[PDB]
Design a binder for this molecule. Structure first.
Ligand SMILES: [Zn+2]
Length: 28
């Protein structure tokens, strides 16, 4: 439910905000 997934690893964030933060952390 509201699964914002990181196109770099298996990570689905509940918030789109969280996704943005994660993606900019998920540089590796
Ligand atoms: Zn990621």
């Amino acid at each position: 439910s509201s699964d914002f997934c990181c196109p770099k690893c298996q990570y689905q964030a509940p918030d789109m905000d969280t996704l943005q933060i994660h993606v900019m952390e998920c540089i590796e």
